[PDB]
Amino acid sequence: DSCSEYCSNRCPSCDGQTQTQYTLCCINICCP
């Protein structure tokens, strides 16, 4: 979690969401 699926950095603030919102958070906010 914390964007481990998509990123080398970590953003736990993306946790706790439904799937598309999680993915958006990770790829556009955590590690664009």
Residue numbers in the entry: 1 to 32
Authors' description from the paper:
Lybatides are cysteine-rich and highly constrained peptides. Alignment of lybatides revealed that they contain eight highly conserved cysteine residues arranged in a unique spacing of C-C-C-C-CC-CC, with a sequence identity of 76.5% between the two. Disulfide mapping of lybatides revealed a novel disulfide connectivity of CysI‒CysVI, CysII‒CysVIII, CysIII‒CysVII and CysIV‒CysV. Comparison of its cysteine arrangements, disulfide connectivity and overall three-dimensional structure to other cysteine-rich peptides show that lybatides represent a new family of CRP with an unusual cystine-stabilized helical structure that has not been described in other plant CRPs.
The process was repeated to determine the sequence of the 33-residue Lyba2 as DSCSEYCSNRCPSCDGQTQTQYTLCCINICCPS. There are three copies of the peptide molecule (named A, B and C) per asymmetric unit (ASU) of the crystal. The four disulfide bonds are formed by Cys3‒Cys26, Cys7‒Cys31, Cys11‒Cys30 and Cys14‒Cys25 according to the X-ray structure. Cys3, Cys7 and Cys11 are located in the N terminal loop, which is stabilized via disulfide bonds with Cys26, Cys31 and Cys30 of the π helix. Cys14 is situated at the C-terminus of the one-turn 310 helix and connects with Cys25 of the π helix (molecule A) and α helix (molecules B and C). Instead of the α-helix – α-helix cystine stabilization found in thionins or the α-helix – β-sheets stabilization in plant defensins, the (α + π)-helix in lybatides is stabilized by four disulfide bonds located in two turns (the β-turn 2–6 and the 310-helical turn 12–14) and one loop (7–11) in the N-terminal portion of the peptide. The distortion of the α-helix towards a π-helix in the C-terminal half of lybatides is of interest. This is very likely caused by conformational stress induced by the disulfide bonds at the C-terminus (Cys30 and Cys31). Interestingly, we found that a short polyethylene glycol molecule (PEG, HO-(CH2-CH2-O)3-CH2-CH2-OH, here named “P40”) stabilizes the crystal lattice by filling a cleft between molecule C and its symmetry-related copy C* (symmetry operator: X-1, Y, Z). The majority of its interactions with peptide copies C and C* consist of water-mediated hydrogen bonds.
